[PDB]
Amino acid sequence: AREGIIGHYIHHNQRVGVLVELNCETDFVARNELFQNLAKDLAMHIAMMNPRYVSAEEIPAEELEKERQIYIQAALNEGKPQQIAEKIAEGRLKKYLEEVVLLEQPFVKDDKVKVKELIQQAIAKIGENIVVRRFCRFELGA
């Protein structure tokens, strides 16, 4: 069975809302405010940063390749030979992962830390494995 909480964040303008399931090992940690603040902060980060996936593995190979091809064609359209265009696309893909993947995004409260490192920091402090299971972000009109 899963332990943890459903963290959330509702923007003051009530135009953006997020729910996030943050899992841990025990109800004791789940009830703890340190863990509760982490779920709350993750929910706020998601609302502000709009990631589409929790992790890189969730991106469809077709979605990834299409984006990569856009990068490639653009460079090719710049007169860049295939080999260069591929390296350029390589870099833009890394950026693309930071645009859409939660764990790869710099944390809203400290952009010097990626969300995945924030999580490792929490596991080290708290002492239990912590996992962001899923999240849902609704934005008015989008």
Add this chain to the structure above:
Amino acid sequence: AREGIIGHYIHHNQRVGVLVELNCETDFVARNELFQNLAKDLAMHIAMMNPRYVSAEEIPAEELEKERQIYIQAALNEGKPQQIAEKIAEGRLKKYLEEVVLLEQPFVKDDKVKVKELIQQAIAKIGENIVVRRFCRFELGA
């Protein structure tokens, strides 16, 4: 463009959370507490009642038929001839719609009103078309 708000409800035990996009015609109504209370109440209803769809049209024909066949086979397994089993299944399907469809569920704050009628009541009072666009319900461990 869409007007309205993202309503929400987080259970006190933080084990269930819901976001609901409630749409209206103007920002003036969207900012209004009557509309805001309706979005809030819909979000609470969803959290407590666990509907899977907003409306009946969203149910997969395969999901519906499978459920209907369970009803039918059960009655057939009771020695009920096909014609009777079909009428029994007909009734259980109506109930099935009330189990999983939001608009067909009796409102948590007044079970004498289906959520769809609550909405018609709000449109009559408020004076603008109101639509539940979508909702997301997260439950810890489920």
